[PDB]
């Protein structure tokens, strides 16, 4: 149903609340009641029209397939290529992952897109991440691997993954601090 | 899991499968060294199965073959972080051991250039600094391992210690032994005494000698003890880093240096250095030239695989997913097949 500015615009009348809600009961009761095609096209003037892009699949000199990605996380920005088949191996900024990410939780987010579609050991993998800490650049490359490999598993795991949250792009950044205030939200403690 | 136990007859037929060890050869020839976690590792199974590897089967090709006529060869040990070349270096202690030669079993050479509170002038020499309780554990740990070869073997010098105390020639090491030991002061004499003696009498066939040195890269960096004036010290200051070196040179013959690169417990040297030039500097490659590099990987999926049903056999993998196909993978991916990463992730899962 068109909104109230809508209504007053083909109007060209101002209305009130309660004036759009008793035309939008009117107009629902009118569709319920089996409005035939005469009733429908009046209907019509009044009602207003309301998945994951999988990448391309590019072949290497060599002539074996990949598909690359780009994921932002925070500060840090990781771009990742996935080759079709593969044996787990993974290199980041040229170094293997467990060398790069020491840390068993960083570890765990590289696996988590892998281990989720169940192709652990498939694929192979080259990223490089730059900014943020650890963390961060973990994130935006579990991000990069997600988009990458969706083009290589089927769409209903694409649409697996996007429901368990693997292909959306974290909008929790570092809020800016506030003058007059310690922090982003911490407030100098008040002296009554 | 192999029914061969003997460390020389096993080889590429008994690659990727555990070799055991007996509580008494366990305390004797390894009552140091062994990585701590390994040690705890043992405490709980009561057992000490170690998996055979290529680097391990190599170097015990090249030690079979070797000629005690040449002057001794180096085999140096190296490879990423937690890929088992202490163990590695462990079980060729063991094969040597068992062949019934003399180990001189350094556990870590790391230890000997920091952290040190009892740094004292060494009285043989006023320009060089002594680490007695370091000198006197060793010593402790040496005559345990080799007690039967200490009475056997004598010494061939007049070894003065006190203005009136000294060792006679034709004396048994285990004089010498047994004065360090229980003289704490003379701890670094009596060290850099048996590593003379060794070295001497190796090259006159009195048996064939292994110097098992881990961490070697320690003796050529840099140390973090600082002299009372707050200077920091080399370590060709420390009389024992001193006789270590002297000892890791090829001019004798009669033995094997074997000796293991550990960037872990390293000084000033960045985590994901571990090839040996990054890890043992110019001096450092230098001294060792030349020298055999054996490398030591992460478990290939063969190696992986036996060692996580040998967890699951001691029944470590307590999670009820361990066993699946899935958890095996997981543990797979989480520990790129690294043998410390994957001990490490299996001691809490
Ligand atoms: N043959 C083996 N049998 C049993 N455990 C082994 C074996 N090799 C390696 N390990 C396991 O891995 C560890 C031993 O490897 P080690 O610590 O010597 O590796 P490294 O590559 O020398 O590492 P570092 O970087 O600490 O020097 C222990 O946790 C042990 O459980
Ligand atoms: N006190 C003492 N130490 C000895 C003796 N012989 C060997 N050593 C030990 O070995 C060192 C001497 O070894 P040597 O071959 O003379 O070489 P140097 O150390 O360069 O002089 C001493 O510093 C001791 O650690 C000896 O007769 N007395
Ligand atoms: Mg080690």
């Not at chain 2, 070196?245 to 013959?253: G, I, L, Q, V």
């Amino acid at each position: 149903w068109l909104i109230k500015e809508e209504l007053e615009e083909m109007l060209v009348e101002k209305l009130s609340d309660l004036d759009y809600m008793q035309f939008i009961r009117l107009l629902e009761k009118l569709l319920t009641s089996q409005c035939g095609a005469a009733e429908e096209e009046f209907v019509q003037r009044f009602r207003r029209s309301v998945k994951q892009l999988i990448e391309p699949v590019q072949y290497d000199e060599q002539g074996m397939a990949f598909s690359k990605s780009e994921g932002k996380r925070k500060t840090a920005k990781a771009e990742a290529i996935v080759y079709k088949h593969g044996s787990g191996r993974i290199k980041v900024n040229g170094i293997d992952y467990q060398l790069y990410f020491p840390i068993t939780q960083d570890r765990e987010q590289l696996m988590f897109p892998f281990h989720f579609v169940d192709r652990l050991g498939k694929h192979d993998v080259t990223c490089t991440v730059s900014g943020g800490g650890r963390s961060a650049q973990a994130g935006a490359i579990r991000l990069a691997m997600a988009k990458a490999l969706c083009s290589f598993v089927t769409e209903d795991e694409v649409e697996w993954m996007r429901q368990a949250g693997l292909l959306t792009t974290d909008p929790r950044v570092r809020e800016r601090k506030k003058p007059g205030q310690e922090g982003a939200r911490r407030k100098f403690t008040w002296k009554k | 899991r192999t029914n061969e136990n003997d460390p020389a007859k096993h080889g590429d037929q008994h690659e990727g499968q555990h070799y055991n060890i007996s509580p008494q050869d366990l305390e004797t020839v390894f009552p140091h060294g062994l990585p701590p976690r390994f040690v705890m590792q043992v405490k709980t199974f009561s057992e000490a199965c170690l998996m055979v590897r290529k680097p391990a089967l190599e170097l015990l090709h090249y030690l079979k073959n070797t000629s005690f006529a040449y002057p001794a060869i180096r085999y140096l040990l190296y490879g990423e972080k937690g890929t088992g070349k202490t163990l590695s270096l462990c079980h060729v202690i063991h094969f040597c051991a068992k062949q019934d030669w003399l180990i001189l079993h350094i556990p870590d050479a790391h230890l000997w250039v920091k952290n040190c509170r009892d740094l004292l002038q060494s009285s043989y020499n006023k320009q060089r600094f002594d680490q007695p309780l370091e000198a006197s554990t060793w010593l402790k740990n040496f005559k345990t391992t080799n007690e039967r070869f200490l009475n056997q073997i004598k010494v061939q010098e007049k070894y003065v210690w006190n203005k009136r105390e000294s060792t006679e020639k034709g004396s048994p090491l285990g004089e010498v032994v047994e004065q360090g030991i229980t003289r704490v002061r003379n701890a670094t004499d009596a060290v850099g005494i048996v590593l003379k003696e060794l070295k001497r009498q190796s090259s006159l066939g009195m048996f064939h000698l292994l110097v098992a040195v881990d961490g070697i890269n320690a003796l050529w960096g840099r140390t973090t003890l600082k002299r009372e004036d707050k200077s920091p010290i080399a370590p060709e200051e420390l009389a024992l880093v001193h006789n270590l070196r002297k000892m890791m040179k090829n001019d004798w013959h009669g033995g094997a240096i074997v000796s293991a690169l550990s960037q872990t417990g390293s000084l000033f040297k960045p985590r994901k250095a571990y090839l040996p030039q990054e890890l043992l500097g110019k001096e450092g490659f230098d001294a060792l030239d030349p020298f055999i590099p054996i490398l030591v990987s992460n478990y290939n999926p063969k190696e992986f695989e036996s060692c996580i049903q040998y967890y699951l056999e001691n029944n470590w993998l307590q999670h009820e997913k361990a066993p699946t196909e899935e958890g095996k993978k997981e543990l797979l991916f989480l520990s790129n097949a690294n043998p410390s990463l994957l001990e490490r992730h299996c001691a809490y899962l």
